[PDB]
Coordinates of C-alpha atoms in Angstrom, one line a residue:
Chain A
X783 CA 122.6 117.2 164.8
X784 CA 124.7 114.9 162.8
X785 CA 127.4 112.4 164.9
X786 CA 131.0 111.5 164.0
X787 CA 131.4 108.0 162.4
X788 CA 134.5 106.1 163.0
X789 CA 135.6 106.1 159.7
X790 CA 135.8 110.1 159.9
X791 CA 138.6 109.6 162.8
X792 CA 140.0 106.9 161.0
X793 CA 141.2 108.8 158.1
X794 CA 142.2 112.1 160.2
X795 CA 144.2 109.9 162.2
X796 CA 146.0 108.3 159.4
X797 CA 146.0 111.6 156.8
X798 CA 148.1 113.1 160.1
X799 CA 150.3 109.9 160.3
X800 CA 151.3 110.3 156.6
X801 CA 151.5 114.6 157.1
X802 CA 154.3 113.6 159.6
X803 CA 156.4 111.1 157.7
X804 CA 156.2 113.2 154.2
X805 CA 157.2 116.7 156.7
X806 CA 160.3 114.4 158.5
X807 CA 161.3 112.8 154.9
X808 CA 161.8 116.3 154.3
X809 CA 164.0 117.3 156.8
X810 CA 166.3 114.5 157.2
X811 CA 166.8 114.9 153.5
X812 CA 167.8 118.7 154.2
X813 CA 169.8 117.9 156.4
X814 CA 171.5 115.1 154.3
X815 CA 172.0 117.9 151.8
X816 CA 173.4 120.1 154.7
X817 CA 175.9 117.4 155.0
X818 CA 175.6 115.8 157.9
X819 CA 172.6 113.6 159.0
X820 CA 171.3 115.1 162.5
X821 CA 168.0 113.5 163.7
X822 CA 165.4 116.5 164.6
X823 CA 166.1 115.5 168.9
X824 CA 169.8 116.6 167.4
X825 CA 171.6 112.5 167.7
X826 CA 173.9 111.8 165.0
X827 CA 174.2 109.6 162.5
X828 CA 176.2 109.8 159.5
X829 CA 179.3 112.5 159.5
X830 CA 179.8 112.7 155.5
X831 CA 182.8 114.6 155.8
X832 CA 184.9 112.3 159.1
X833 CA 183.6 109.3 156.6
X834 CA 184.8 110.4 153.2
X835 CA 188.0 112.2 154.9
Chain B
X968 CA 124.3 112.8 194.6
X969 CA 122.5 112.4 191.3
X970 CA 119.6 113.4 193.7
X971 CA 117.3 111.7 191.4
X972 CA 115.8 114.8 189.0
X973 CA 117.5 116.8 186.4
X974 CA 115.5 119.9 185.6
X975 CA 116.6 121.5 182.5
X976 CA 114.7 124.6 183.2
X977 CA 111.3 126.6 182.5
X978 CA 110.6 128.5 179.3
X979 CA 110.8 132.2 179.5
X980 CA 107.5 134.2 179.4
X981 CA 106.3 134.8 175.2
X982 CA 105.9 138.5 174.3
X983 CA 101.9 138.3 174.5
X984 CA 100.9 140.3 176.9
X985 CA 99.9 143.2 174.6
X986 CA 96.4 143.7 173.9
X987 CA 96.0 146.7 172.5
X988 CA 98.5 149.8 172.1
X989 CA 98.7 153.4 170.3
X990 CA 101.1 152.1 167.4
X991 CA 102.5 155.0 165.3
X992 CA 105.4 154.7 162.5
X993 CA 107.7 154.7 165.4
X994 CA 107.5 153.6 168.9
X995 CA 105.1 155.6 170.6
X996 CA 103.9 153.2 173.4
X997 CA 107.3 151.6 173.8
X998 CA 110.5 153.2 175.0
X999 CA 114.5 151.7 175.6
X1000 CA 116.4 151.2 177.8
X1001 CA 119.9 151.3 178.7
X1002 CA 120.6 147.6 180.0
X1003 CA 121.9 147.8 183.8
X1004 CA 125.2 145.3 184.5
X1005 CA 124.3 142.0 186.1
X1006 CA 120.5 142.8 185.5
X1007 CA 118.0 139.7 184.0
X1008 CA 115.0 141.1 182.0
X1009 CA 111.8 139.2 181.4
X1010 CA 108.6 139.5 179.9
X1011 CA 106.0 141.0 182.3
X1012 CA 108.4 142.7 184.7
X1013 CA 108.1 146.3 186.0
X1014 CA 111.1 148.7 185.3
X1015 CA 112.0 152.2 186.6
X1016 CA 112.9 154.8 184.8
X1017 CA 117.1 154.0 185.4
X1018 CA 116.0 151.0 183.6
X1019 CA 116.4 148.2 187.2
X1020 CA 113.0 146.5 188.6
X1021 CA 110.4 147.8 191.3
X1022 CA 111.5 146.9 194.9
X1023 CA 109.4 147.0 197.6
X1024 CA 108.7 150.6 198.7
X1025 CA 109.1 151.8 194.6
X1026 CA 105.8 151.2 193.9
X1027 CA 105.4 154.6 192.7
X1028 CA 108.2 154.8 190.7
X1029 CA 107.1 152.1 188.2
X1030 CA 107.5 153.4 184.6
X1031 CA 107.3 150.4 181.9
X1032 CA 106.2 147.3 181.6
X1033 CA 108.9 144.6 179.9
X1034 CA 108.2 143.0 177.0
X1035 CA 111.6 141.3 176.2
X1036 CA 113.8 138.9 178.0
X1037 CA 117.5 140.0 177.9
X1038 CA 120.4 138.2 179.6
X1039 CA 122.8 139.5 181.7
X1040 CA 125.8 137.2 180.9
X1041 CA 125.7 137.6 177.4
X1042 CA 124.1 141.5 177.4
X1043 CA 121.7 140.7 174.3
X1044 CA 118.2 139.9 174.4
X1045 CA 116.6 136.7 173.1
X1046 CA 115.9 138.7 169.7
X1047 CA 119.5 139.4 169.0
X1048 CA 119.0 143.1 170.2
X1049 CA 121.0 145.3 172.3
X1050 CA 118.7 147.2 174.1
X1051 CA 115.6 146.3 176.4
X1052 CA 112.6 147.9 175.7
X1053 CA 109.1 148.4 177.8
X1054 CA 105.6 149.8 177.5
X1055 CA 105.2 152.8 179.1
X1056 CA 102.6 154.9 177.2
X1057 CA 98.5 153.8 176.5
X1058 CA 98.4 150.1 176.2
X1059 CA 96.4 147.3 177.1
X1060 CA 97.7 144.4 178.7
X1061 CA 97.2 141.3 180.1
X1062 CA 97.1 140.8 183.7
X1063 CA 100.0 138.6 184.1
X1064 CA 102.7 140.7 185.8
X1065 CA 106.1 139.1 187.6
X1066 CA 106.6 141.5 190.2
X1067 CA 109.8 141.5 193.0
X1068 CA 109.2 140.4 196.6
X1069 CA 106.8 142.1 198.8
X1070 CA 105.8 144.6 196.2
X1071 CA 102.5 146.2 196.1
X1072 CA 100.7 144.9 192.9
X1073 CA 97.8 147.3 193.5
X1074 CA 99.9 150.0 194.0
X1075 CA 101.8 149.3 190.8
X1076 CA 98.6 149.1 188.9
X1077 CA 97.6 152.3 189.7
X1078 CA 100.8 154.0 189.2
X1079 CA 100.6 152.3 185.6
X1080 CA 97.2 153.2 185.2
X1081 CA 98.0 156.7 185.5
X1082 CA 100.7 156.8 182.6
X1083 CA 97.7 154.6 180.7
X1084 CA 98.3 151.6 180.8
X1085 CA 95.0 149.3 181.4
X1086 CA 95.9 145.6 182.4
X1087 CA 92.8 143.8 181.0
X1088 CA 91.5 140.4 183.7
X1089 CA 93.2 137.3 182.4
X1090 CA 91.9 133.8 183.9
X1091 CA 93.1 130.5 184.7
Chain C
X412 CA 118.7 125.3 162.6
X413 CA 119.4 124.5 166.3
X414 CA 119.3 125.6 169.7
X415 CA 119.8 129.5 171.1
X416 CA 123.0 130.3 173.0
X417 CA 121.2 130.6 176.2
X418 CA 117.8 129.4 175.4
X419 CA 116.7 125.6 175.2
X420 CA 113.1 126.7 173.3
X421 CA 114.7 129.4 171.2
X422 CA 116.6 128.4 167.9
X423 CA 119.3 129.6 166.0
X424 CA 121.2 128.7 162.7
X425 CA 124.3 126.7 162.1
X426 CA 126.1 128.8 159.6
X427 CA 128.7 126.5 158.7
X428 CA 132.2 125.8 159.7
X429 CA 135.9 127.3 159.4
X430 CA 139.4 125.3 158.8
X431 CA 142.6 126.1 160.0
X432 CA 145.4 123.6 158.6
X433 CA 149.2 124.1 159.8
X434 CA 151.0 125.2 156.5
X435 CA 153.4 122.4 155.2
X436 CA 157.0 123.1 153.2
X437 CA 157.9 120.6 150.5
X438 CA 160.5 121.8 148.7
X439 CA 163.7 120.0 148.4
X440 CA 161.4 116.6 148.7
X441 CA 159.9 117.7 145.4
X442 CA 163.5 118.0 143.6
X443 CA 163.9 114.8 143.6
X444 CA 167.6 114.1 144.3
X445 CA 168.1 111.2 146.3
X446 CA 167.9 108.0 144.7
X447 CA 165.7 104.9 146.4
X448 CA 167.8 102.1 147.5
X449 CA 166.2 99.3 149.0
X450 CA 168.3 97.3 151.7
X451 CA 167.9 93.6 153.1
X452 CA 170.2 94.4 156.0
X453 CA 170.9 96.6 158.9
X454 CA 174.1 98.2 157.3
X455 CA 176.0 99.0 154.3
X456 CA 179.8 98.8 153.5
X457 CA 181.6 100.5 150.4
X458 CA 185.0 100.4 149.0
X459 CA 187.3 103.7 148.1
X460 CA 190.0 103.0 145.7
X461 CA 191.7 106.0 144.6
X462 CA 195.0 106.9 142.8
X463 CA 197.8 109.9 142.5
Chain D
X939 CA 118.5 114.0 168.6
X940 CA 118.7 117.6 169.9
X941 CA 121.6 118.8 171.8
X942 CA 123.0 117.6 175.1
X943 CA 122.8 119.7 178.6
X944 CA 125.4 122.1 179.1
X945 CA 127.2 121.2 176.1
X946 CA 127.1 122.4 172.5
X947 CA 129.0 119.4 171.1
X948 CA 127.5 116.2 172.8
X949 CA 123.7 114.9 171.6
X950 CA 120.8 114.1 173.2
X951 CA 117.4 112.4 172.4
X952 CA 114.2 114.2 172.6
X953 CA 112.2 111.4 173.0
X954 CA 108.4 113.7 173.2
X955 CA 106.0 115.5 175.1
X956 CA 103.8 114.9 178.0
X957 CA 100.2 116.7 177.3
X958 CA 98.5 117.9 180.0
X959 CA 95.1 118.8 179.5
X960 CA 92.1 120.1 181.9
X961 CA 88.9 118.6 182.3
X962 CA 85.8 119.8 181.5
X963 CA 82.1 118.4 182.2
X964 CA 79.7 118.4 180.1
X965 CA 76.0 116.4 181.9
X966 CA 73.9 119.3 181.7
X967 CA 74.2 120.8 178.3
X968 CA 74.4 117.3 177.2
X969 CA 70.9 116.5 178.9
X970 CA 69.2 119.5 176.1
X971 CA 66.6 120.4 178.4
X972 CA 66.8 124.2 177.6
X973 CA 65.0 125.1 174.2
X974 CA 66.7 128.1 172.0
X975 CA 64.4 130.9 171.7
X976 CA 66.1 133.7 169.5
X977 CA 65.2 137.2 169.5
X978 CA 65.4 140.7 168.8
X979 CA 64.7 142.8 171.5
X980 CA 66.7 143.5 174.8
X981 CA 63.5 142.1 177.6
X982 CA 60.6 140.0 176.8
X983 CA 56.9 139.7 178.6
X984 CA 54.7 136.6 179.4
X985 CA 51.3 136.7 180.3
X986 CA 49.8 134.6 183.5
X987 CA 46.6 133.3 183.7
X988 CA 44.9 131.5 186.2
X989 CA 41.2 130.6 186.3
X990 CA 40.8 128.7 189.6
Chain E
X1230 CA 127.2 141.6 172.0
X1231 CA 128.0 144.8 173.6
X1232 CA 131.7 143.8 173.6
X1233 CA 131.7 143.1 170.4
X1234 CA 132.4 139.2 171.0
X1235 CA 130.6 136.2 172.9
X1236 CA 132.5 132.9 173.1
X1237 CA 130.3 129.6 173.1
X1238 CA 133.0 127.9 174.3
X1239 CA 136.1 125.5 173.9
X1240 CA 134.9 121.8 173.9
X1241 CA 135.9 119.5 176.6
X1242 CA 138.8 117.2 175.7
X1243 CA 137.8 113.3 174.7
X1244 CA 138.4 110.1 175.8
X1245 CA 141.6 109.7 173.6
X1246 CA 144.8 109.8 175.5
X1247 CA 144.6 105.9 176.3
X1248 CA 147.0 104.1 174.1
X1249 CA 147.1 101.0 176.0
X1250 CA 145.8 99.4 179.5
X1251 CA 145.2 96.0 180.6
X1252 CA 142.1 94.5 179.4
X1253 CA 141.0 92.0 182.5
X1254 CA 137.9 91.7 182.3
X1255 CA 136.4 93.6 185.7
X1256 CA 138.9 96.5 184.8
X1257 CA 142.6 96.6 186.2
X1258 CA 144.2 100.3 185.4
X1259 CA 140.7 101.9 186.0
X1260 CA 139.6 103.0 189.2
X1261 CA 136.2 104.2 190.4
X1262 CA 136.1 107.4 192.3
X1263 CA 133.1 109.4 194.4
X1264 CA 133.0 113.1 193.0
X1265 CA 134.0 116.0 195.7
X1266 CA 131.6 118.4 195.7
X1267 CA 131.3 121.4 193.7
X1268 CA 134.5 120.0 191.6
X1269 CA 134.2 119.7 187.8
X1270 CA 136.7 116.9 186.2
X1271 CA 138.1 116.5 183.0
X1272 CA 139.8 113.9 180.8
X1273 CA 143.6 114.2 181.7
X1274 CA 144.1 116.0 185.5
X1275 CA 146.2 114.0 188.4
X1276 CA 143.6 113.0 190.8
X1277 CA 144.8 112.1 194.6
X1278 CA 143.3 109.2 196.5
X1279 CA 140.1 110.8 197.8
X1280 CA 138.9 112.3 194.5
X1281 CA 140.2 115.6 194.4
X1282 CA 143.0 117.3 192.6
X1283 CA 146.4 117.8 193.0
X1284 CA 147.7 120.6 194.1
X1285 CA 150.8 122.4 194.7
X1286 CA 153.1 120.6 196.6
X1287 CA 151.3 117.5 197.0
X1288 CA 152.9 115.6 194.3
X1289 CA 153.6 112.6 195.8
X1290 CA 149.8 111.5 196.0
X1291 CA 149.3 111.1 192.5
X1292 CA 146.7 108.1 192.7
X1293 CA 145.5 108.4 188.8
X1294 CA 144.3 110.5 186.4
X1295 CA 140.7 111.4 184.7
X1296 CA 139.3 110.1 182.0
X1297 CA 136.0 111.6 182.0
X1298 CA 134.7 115.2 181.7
X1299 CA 132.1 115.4 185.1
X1300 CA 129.8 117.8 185.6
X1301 CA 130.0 119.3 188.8
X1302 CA 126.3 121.2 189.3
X1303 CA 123.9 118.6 188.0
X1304 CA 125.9 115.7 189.7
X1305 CA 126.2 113.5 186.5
X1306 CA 129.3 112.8 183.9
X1307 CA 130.1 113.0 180.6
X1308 CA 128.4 110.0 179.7
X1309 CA 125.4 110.1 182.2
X1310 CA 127.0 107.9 184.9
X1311 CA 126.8 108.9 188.7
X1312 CA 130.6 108.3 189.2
X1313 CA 133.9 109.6 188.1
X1314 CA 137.1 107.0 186.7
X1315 CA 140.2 107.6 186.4
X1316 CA 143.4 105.3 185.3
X1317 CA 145.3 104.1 188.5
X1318 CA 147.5 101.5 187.3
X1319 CA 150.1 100.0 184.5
X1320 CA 148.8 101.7 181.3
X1321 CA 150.2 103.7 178.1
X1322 CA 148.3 107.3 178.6
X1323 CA 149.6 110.4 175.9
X1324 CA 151.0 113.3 178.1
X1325 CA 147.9 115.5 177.5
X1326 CA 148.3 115.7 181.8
X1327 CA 145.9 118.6 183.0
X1328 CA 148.0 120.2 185.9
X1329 CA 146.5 122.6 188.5
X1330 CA 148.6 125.6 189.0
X1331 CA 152.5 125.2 190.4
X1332 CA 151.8 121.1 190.3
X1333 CA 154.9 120.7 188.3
X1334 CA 154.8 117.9 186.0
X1335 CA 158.2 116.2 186.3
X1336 CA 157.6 115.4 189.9
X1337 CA 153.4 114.0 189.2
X1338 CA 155.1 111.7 186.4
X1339 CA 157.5 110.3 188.7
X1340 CA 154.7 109.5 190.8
X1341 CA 152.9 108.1 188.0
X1342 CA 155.5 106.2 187.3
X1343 CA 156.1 104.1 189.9
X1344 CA 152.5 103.1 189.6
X1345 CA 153.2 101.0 186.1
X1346 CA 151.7 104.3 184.3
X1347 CA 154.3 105.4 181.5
X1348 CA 153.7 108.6 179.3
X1349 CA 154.3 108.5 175.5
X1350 CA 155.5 111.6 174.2
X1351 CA 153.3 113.7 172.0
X1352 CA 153.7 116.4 169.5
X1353 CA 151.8 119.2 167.8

């Protein structure tokens, strides 16, 4: 019989907002090691290797 | 529609009924019962011996006497058990019976009273 | 301690409660290769001089 | 703050009870007309005599 | 049980897929609706103009969408409140849409759309 404060919600909501940042940090920078920089919907960005020749 | 009321509902009948009954290291006055499918048990309520309640023109075929409320959606009674049980055997008990529609009540006394089960006046 | 499944006089216990987080893969975030580089504009430009 | 209806995760308030009692009168044994006369057998004998 | 499993059950979505509405102050994107009959609502299912659901092929109705979770026996809602509401006009809603069964969902956004109501893609 105990209720939800907002502060509870709060910090879920914003713990998930971080979660998803650090978890698409992580895969741009995998694909920046791939070599070229394809956003996760699959849009380029950077082609290293057209760039550098 | 809200028509005005919200009843949440009535409290099952207690297990209280028994008075008095020939209690042995097992269940001498008591006996199971396979639960039937789509079936609601309460306390107080006459069973056969396939385990379903007395209908009108049964009354001779009464066989025990409920003493646990079971539900039929979730197949367990309200003790966490799996099986319904009844008295059958020597036993008194209270004259509160819940009985189906247009059965006999004094022919399902007697029929009890011959197996030996005494139902002892109860008033209110 | 609160109420049976089907019962609104009848009670029952609360156990407790299970988690199931989504498992998370930081590994190539926790080598630590790329270097920060802060930016006050919208793009960068850099020169490559080279020689045979 | 109990449970709500038809739901296991919303709250309600049981706010109490409503007592309903029967009544019960009590005038006559409250008058004490009737004197307590203990005793040990089952039937008791009294004697009438009338000189007239 | 005797099945070896009972389900409590899966707890009825919340009030969270509103990410932004107008604010006037009598309400502009929410609309008040009488509940059909027998019909249980939830938070997030296309509702057509007089209350009910929409259903396969009727796509182009579309009026709004829940936003509470009524209960259909007892009459009342999620919060206690005779009627049901749903968003009906220019608003930010998550796509958290509860579709009947062959509604398809490109067709009841379009619908939506051309009410002001714009979908925000969501991801788990």
């Amino acid at each position: 019989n105990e209720l939800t404060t907002e502060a509870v919600v709060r910090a879920k909501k914003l713990m998930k907002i971080r979660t998803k940042f650090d978890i698409t940090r992580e895969f741009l920078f995998m694909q920046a090691l791939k070599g070229k920089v394809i956003d996760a919907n699959g849009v380029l960005y950077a082609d290293l290797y057209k760039q550098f020749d | 529609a809200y028509q005005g009321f919200t009843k949440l509902g009535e409290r099952e009948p207690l297990n209280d009924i028994i008075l008095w009954e020939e209690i042995t290291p097992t269940g001498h006055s008591r006996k199971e019962y396979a639960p039937v499918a789509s079936t609601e048990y309460r306390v107080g309520e006459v069973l056969k011996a396939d385990g379903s309640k007395v209908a009108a023109g049964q009354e001779a075929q009464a066989d025990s006497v409920c003493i646990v409320n079971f539900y039929a959606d979730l197949q367990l009674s309200y003790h966490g058990q799996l099986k319904v049980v009844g008295i059958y055997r020597d036993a008194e008990l209270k004259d509160l019976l819940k009985l189906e529609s247009g059965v006999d009540a004094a022919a399902v006394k007697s029929a009890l009273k011959a197996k030996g089960i005494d139902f002892v006046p109860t008033g209110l | 301690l609160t109420n049976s499944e089907k019962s609104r006089f009848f009670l029952a216990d609360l156990t407790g409660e299970v988690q199931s987080i989504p498992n998370t893969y930081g590994y190539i975030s926790g080598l630590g290769l790329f270097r920060s580089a802060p930016q006050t504009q919208t793009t960068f430009l850099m020169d490559l001089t080279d020689w045979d």
